[PDB]
Amino acid sequence: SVLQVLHIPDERLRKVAKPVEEVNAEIQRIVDDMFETMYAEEGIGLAATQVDIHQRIIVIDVSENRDERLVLINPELLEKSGETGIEEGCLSIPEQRALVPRAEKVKIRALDRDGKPFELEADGLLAICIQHEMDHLVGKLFMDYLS
Numbered sequence: 001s002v003l004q005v006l007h008i009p010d011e012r013l014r015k016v017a018k019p020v021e022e023v024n025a026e027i028q029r030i031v032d033d034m035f036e037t038m039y040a041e042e043g044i045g046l047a048a049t050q051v052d053i054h055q056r057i058i059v060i061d062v063s064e065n066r067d068e069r070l071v072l073i074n075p076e077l078l079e080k081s082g083e084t085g086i087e088e089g090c091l092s093i094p095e096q097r098a099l100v101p102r103a104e105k106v107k108i109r110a111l112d113r114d115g116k117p118f119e120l121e122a123d124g125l126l127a128i129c130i131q132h133e134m135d136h137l138v139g140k141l142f143m144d145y146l147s
């Protein structure tokens with residue numbers, strides 16, 4: 001159930017996503033496919049732009065517990081701390097994983113695939129991935145700082 005995934009180079013991956021004022025059934029389908037894809041990609045997280053949606057919608061798959069199943073809509077960063085660097089690849093890139101620097105822990109606000117905006121604190125792999133999707137969907141990508 002994978003939608004249309006955009007690959008680097010791609011304007012939409014480098015495109016800034018806009019966080020919608022309200023979760024529409026169209027927006028819900030977008031996330032639903034985003035996970036469906038991301039998983040189909042076996043990715044630990046997929047960002048809206050990646051799946052061809054120029055809207056700040058993020059879906060996570062970081063086993064921060066027993067079963068992976070994180071969804072956030074129009075997430076925004078609230079706080080970041082610590083400096084990390086870990087290799088990863090992007091659904092847009094052909095699995096070319098590189099070590100990208102991001103904060104060690106970060107707390108961000110988002111709404112669930114159900115349509116309820118809440119604030120969640122992310123640390124480690126959670127904080128890294130969630131913050132990464134924020135960047136990716138805002139058209140910013142780790143490659144922007146790789147060299």
Ligand SMILES: CCCCC[C@H](CC(=O)NO)C(=O)N[C@H](C(=O)N1CCC[C@H]1CO)C(C)C
Pocket residue numbers: 041042043044045046047050058059060061062087088089090091092095097128129130132133136
């Ligand atoms: C909720 C967001 C979670 C982080 C997403 C990352 C990188 C990405 O493409 N973000 O848009 C991802 O899962 N990377 C995967 C991958 O290359 N690796 C393998 C190890 C885990 C992950 C990052 O290194 C690919 C398959 C999508």
Ligand SMILES: [Zn+2]
Pocket residue numbers: 047089090091092132136
């Ligand atoms: Zn990515």
